[PDB]
Amino acid sequence: GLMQFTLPVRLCKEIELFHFDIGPFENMWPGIFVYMVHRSCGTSCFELEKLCRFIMSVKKNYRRVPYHNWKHAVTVAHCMYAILQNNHTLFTDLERKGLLIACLCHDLDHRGFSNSYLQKFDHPLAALYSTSTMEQHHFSQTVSILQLEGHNIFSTLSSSEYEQVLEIIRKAIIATDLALYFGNRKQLEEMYQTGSLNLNNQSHRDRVIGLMMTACDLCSVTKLWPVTKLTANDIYAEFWAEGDEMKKLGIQPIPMMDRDKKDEVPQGQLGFYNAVAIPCYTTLTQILPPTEPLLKACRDNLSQWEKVIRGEE
Numbered sequence: 001g002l003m004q005f006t007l008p009v010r011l012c013k014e015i016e017l018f019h020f021d022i023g024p025f026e027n028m029w030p031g032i033f034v035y036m037v038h039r040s041c042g043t044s045c046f047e048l049e050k051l052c053r054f055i056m057s058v059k060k061n062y063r064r065v066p067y068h069n070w071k072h073a074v075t076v077a078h079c080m081y082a083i084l085q086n087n088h089t090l091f092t093d094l095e096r097k098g099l100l101i102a103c104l105c106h107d108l109d110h111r112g113f114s115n116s117y118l119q120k121f122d123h124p125l126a127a128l129y130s131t132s133t134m135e136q137h138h139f140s141q142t143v144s145i146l147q148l149e150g151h152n153i154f155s156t157l158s159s160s161e162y163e164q165v166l167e168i169i170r171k172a173i174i175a176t177d178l179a180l181y182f183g184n185r186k187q188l189e190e191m192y193q194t195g196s197l198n199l200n201n202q203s204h205r206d207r208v209i210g211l212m213m214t215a216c217d218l219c220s221v222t223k224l225w226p227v228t229k230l231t232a233n234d235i236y237a238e239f240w241a242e243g244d245e246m247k248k249l250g251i252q253p254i255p256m257m258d259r260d261k262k263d264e265v266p267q268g269q270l271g272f273y274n275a276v277a278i279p280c281y282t283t284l285t286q287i288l289p290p291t292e293p294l295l296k297a298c299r300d301n302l303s304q305w306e307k308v309i310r311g312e313e
């Protein structure tokens with residue numbers, strides 16, 4: 001009960017910032033997560049022996065892939081920690097509990113391949129789940145580990161509270177399907193502009209949590225340029241391996257996934273910032289103004305990509 005986690009002074013300070021990097025020491029991430037749960041939620045939210053066993057089991061069921069790995073899981077969880085700690089009064093006790101657990105679990109057992117490739121490969125997960133194929137799998141792994149003996153971190157919640165939090169974690173994980181972002185944001189953009197957005201409307205909260213989940217998932221674009229620049233190598237490492245497997249199926253992949261089309265990368269990142277990243281963080285700041293730093297960081301990186309095309313680096 002009185003066993004607090006404490007971080008060294010550079011981390012303790014930098015961890016409150018949106019652009020914080022969790023660093024290259026794998027073994028510190030579990031303690032980084034727990035620190036955040038305690039400060040974001042409270043020291044009572046979870047049983048420390050249960051939480052740690054949950055965490056190390058989640059770690060185990062992430063794979064050794066270049067991008068969609070254990071570091072991505074903790075990085076997305078930290079972005080959600082920054083958002084919750086800059087919006088102290090807007091979210092309930094269950095939402096703060098569920099969303100940090102949702103984020104850590106969002107990409108559980110990812111192979112480094114898009115829904116599209118599973119479909120075209122005719123993977124068994126595609127037959128079992130026709131849309132949001134990987135995200136329905138990710139949630140299935142989360143329920144699986146939650147049920148493993150000694151892992152039920154929600155064991156003090158009532159029957160109905162436990163269902164609410166699992167429903168928060170489900171919607172949360174499905175929302176990380178980028179194919180569902182476009183319409184979710186457009187709907188929020190209207191609701192804000194026509195001024196009909198209402199945070200007490202449960203269908204409205206679900207949407208806003210969905211956008212938070214996209215925001216946190218894409219948070220590589222919201223870091224300082226050297227972290228953004230280097231993370232992009234891992235993202236493209238996966239994309240090119242997927243293209244290789246598309247070619248192996250007898251299908252030219254899109255240029256984004258064709259490693260013979262590296263020259264177009266800078267332009268492709270512009271497309272993405274302009275089409276996905278800026279619209280995401282614009283709309284999120286409109287709804288949650290204290291998340292303006294993500295928008296600012298995103299625009300800075302956009303400018304850095306323009307500079308790359310211009311041959312200034």
Ligand SMILES: Cc1ccc(C)c(C(=O)Nc2ccn3cc(-c4ccccc4)nc3n2)n1
Binds near residue numbers: 255272
């Ligand atoms: C930093 C980050 C985080 C998350 C995602 C999902 C992406 C992402 O989607 N990036 C993208 C999108 C579309 N792209 C298209 C291209 C292209 C390349 C070479 C020739 C033609 C076209 N690259 C792309 N990269 N990028």
Ligand SMILES: [Mg+2]
Binds near residue numbers: 106107176177
């Ligand atoms: Mg995902």
Ligand SMILES: [Zn+2]
Binds near residue numbers: 072076106107176217
């Ligand atoms: Zn993710």
